RNA sequence: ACCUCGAUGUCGGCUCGUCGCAUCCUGGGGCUGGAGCAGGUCCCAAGGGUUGGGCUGUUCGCCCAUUAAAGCGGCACGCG
RNA sequence: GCCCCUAAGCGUGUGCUAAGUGGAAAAGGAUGUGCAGUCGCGAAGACAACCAGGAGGUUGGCUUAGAAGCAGCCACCCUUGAAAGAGUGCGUAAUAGCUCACUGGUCAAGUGAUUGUGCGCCGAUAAUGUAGCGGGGCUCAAGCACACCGCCGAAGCCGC
């Protein structure tokens, strides 16, 4: 790619985080090309699931608070934003993970605060 | 040559110092000096160093 | 269709001669004249290194300024000498051009697209002479050839051309010609 | 195997083989083309070769142009016969080539296989030569 | 030379003693000595980690950093811990056994063949179809299975002979 | 071993070194192996 | 046609050897369209050996019977 | 010509050579080495490595007993998109698998390519005995490249 290129990707990822609601990151390490797609079809009716290079969304994170999140992207991380409602994806990729045991959620981002795997549990039970 | 390295000077430096200096002595009387008189050419040798120039290599 | 003139710096020739010339060349840098209308022609020198760049930068043909002792010139590359073996710059020559005036340029053109299966690529012209002005001067023609069939001869006067350009040379001249592939039985009859 | 139809003369002399070729020295029927680099005998049958070899690879597309012509004579006696008592009767014709002269033009669309062919033009040839584009 | 940049680790439990050119190891597992290039020079960093510094940026000084920063982390790291490679006897009518410190292989030969264990090493024997050799020093370990496999030849249509853990033999089979 | 003046990268992977001023080029495919000489 | 026409004796056979390796075997390796033997090819290697007969003045060559092979050449087409 | 056999610098200053090149030779081949001029990418993290992904229409049609991405011939189109190339191959009759291309995670700055160049290496095998620097020997050049200062050197020149 150009540096045109991750210019516009870093745009493009702004307006898509400005016009979602939340965002979750999580690890697609040890999941298949399928199962994948399925599951991205599964959340295609309100979410959308996405990756992108690590440093370029550091480096898009600068204009909102998202900043506290930069070391929780040590590792894979596959962002996925929810356009409508929140809990919907996030009960999506935790039963997909627990169903396939190869997918671990690093976190999400909600209410302008970085919180743990255990407070994502808990917002996608609630 | 041999007295020459002796004295610790070579031939060439020898020869081109005596020259400078403007002495006209050949090689039949510096050879009968070099058996004859080691003081003949202790004396040679520093008009000769005396007579050399400060730098060799110098473009002049 | 506007360009920018390219900078380098060149020196006026002290000696003049084939001795000093090649004594030049050895050393790095390329004798050149500049003559023109002004009924005033000089010879200078200028760096191979830089004039090789700017002539891979900017093509065959580029607008270029003069820096003579701290004066401003106007001129185009018009002819030179290539080295049959060094692919080397032996001599240029450079006409002064102000601005506002009519030139004779030489230009390339290129083709490219997709061919049918019974398409033959022939290429007889690839080089052109267009009346232009000093700053509209283009470096490269394209033509773009699609489900080419049968005969289809291109002609050089059917090749669309910006504003403000002549096309010198006449409306017969043929660019690009498309004919049937060839055979193995014409392959192996041709030349025996 | 280029031969000339018909020659006014039929034997010539050693031909001279010096200086720089002057006519020739650029490319200009298509795109990209070969240029040599020393003073050599080039023959019809090397050129033949040469031919063949260019069209066995570049296949469909793209055609050739060919520079030179070999109608410059050379003899030869026959093994077993005491030299002199005549010229011998010519062999091969050969075209005298000289340094920088364009042998081969070709113009096919891709960089790959046109760079491809003229090595393989090249692989062929008894001298030295490189690649040449349209471009100087 | 990029890896000679990174310095190598000395874990606690390992003495190091240097003098001038030559450098020792001491640690559990024993100790070694080399003799390294004259040109460079090496320095022990008080934080615990070993720095070698070439003295110009030229060709045997490039060449020889990363040599001997490689060659003293090995030396420390197998000084402390050690090492082992282990192998497999595969075919039929293959036997391997250890009586003492020598070792006896039945591999088809109509004699038995014995090979004498150098000073330093050790051989261990947990089947008589694999077995393991633990040592210090990576030159005489790989020198050992080197020799131990140098035994057969190879045989790219049964897999009759030594090999690795991982070696892989190609296979080809003939119709006739 | 092919012993031959001119050697080269045959496949994308077969590797050219110099050993005694002999450049050899060796791959895993048997047949890649040769010196020049 | 440069030495030899006020002389350099010629082919084969016998005896007598010598040298190089582009090696016939014996020796050590790489690859295979090298299941095993049995092969093919390339490298290194001159230490040693390298048939006897029928035919013709033969060299050469054909044929008969083995061995590991029945080498290529240079030495005034080795040597009156 | 100036290390010794042999008379003169184991001279000076700046660079190259590892091959005894110097001190026999070509086409061609090569991550040998020095110089100069480029462009692509590279702190928005390159290149290499070390975890995962590398499928759904899809077995794309003709051809064939056979054609499923990998005898062959045509677009060499398209979807999820991060990326799937009618697939660079070593894989099976034909499937299925090992992979790979581009892409994503950690490390942390150089990574590639042609361009013109000075030296180099292989290419290199014959016969009495080194025998292709004259020989010894010479890179701690006594080799090569460029300047400077000198000397030896004939029956040439000058002196009687
Ligand atoms: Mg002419
Ligand atoms: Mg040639
Ligand atoms: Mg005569
Ligand atoms: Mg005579
Ligand atoms: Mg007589
Ligand atoms: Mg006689
Ligand atoms: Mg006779
Ligand atoms: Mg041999
Ligand atoms: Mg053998
Ligand atoms: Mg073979
Ligand atoms: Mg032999
Ligand atoms: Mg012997
Ligand atoms: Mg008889
Ligand atoms: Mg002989
Ligand atoms: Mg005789
Ligand atoms: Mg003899
Ligand atoms: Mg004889
Ligand atoms: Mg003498
Ligand atoms: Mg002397
Ligand atoms: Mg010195
Ligand atoms: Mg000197
Ligand atoms: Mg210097
Ligand atoms: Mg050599
Ligand atoms: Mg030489
Ligand atoms: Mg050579
Ligand atoms: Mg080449
Ligand atoms: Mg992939
Ligand atoms: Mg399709
Ligand atoms: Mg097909
Ligand atoms: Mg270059
Ligand atoms: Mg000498
Ligand atoms: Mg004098
Ligand atoms: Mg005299
Ligand atoms: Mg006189
Ligand atoms: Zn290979």
Redesign the interface.
């Given at each position: 790619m150009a540096k045109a290129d991750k210019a516009t990707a870093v745009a493009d990822i702004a307006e898509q985080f400005k016009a979602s609601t939340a965002t979750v990151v999580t690890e697609y390490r040890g999941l298949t090309v399928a199962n994948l797609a399925e599951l991205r079809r599964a959340l295609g009716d309100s979410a959308t699931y996405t990756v992108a290079k690590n440093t370029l969304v550091k480096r898009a994170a600068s204009e909102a608070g998202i900043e506290g999140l930069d070391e929780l992207f040590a590792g894979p991380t596959a962002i996925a934003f929810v356009k409508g409602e929140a809990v919907d994806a996030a009960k999506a990729i935790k039963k997909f993970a627990k169903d396939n045991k190869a997918l671990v959620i690093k976190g999400g981002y909600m209410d302008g605060k970085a919180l743990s795997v255990a407070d994502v549990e808990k917002i996608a039970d609630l | 040559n041999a007295a020459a390295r002796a004295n610790d000077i070579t031939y060439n430096r020898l020869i081109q110092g005596l020259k400078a200096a403007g002495v006209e002595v050949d090689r039949k009387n510096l050879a009968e000096l070099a058996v004859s008189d080691p003081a003949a050419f202790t004396a040679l040798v520093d008009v000769a160093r005396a007579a050399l120039p400060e730098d060799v290599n110098a473009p002049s | 269709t506007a360009n920018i003139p390219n900078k380098l710096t060149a020196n006026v020739r002290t000696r003049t001669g084939k001795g000093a010339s090649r004594q030049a060349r050895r050393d790095g840098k390329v004798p050149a004249v500049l003559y023109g209308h002004g009924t005033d022609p000089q010879h200078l020198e200028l760096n191979a290194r830089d004039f090789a760049a700017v002539?891979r930068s900017h093509?065959?043909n580029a607008i270029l300024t003069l820096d003579i002792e701290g004066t401003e010139q106007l001129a185009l590359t018009k002819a030179?000498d290539?080295?049959?073996?060094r692919?080397n710059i032996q001599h240029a020559d450079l006409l002064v051009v102000q601005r506002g005036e009519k030139v004779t340029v030489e230009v390339?053109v290129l083709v490219?697209g997709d061919?049918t299966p019974g398409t033959?690529?022939?290429?007889?012209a690839?080089?052109i002479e267009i009346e232009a002005e000093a700053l509209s001067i283009p470096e490269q023609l394209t033509v773009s050839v699609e489900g080419v069939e049968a005969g289809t001869q291109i002609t050089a006067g059917q090749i669309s051309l910006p504003e403000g350009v002549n096309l010198i040379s006449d409306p017969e001249l043929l660019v690009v010609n498309v004919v049937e592939?060839?055979s193995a039985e014409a392959?192996e009859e041709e030349?025996? | 195997?280029?031969i000339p139809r018909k020659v006014k003369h039929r034997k010539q002399h050693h031909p001279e083989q010096r200086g720089?070729?002057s006519g020739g020295?650029?490319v200009?029927?298509?795109?990209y083309g070969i240029?040599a680099?020393e003073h050599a005998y080039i023959t019809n049958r090397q050129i033949?070769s040469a031919?063949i070899a260019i069209?066995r690879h570049i296949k469909?597309?793209?055609?050739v142009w060919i520079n030179i012509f070999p109608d410059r004579p050379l003899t030869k006696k026959p093994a077993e016969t005491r030299m002199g008592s005549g010229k011998g009767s010519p062999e091969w014709w050969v075209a005298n080539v000289k340094?920088?002269?364009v042998l081969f033009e070709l113009?096919?669309?891709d960089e790959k296989t046109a760079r491809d062919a003229l090595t393989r033009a090249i692989h062929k040839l008894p001298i030295k030569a490189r690649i040449?584009t349209?471009?100087? | 030379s990029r890896i000679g940049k990174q310095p190598v680790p000395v874990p606690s439990g390992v003495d190091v003693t240097i003098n001038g050119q030559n450098l020792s190891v001491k640690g559990p597992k024993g100790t070694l000595t080399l003799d390294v290039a004259e040109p460079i020079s090496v320095s022990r960093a008080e934080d615990g980690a070993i720095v070698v510094t070439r003295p110009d940026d030229e060709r045997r000084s490039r060449s020889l950093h990363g040599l001997s920063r490689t060659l003293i982390a090995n030396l420390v790291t197998g000084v402390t811990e050690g090492y082992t490679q282990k192998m497999e006897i595969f075919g039929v009518g293959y036997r391997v056994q250890l009586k003492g410190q020598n070792l006896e292989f039945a591999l088809g030969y109509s004699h038995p063949v014995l090979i004498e264990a150098p000073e330093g090493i050790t051989f261990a024997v947990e089947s008589p179809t694999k077995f393991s050799v633990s040592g210090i020093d990576k030159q005489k370990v790989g020198q050992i299975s080197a020799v131990i496999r140098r035994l057969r030849r190879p045989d790219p249509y049964k897999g009759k002979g030594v090999r690795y853990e991982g070696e892989q033999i190609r296979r080809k089979v003939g119709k006739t | 071993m092919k012993v031959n003046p001119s050697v080269k990268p045959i496949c994308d992977k077969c590797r050219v070194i110099r050993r005694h001023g002999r450049v050899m080029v060796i791959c895993s495919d048997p047949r890649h192996k040769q010196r020049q000489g």
């Open positions: - | - | 002539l093509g065959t030179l290539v080295h049959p073996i692919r390339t490219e061919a033959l690529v022939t290429q007889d690839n080089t592939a060839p392959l030349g025996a | 195997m280029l720089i070729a020295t650029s200009s029927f298509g795109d240029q680099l033949e031919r069209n469909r597309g793209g055609k340094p920088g002269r113009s096919y669309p040449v349209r471009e100087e | - | -």
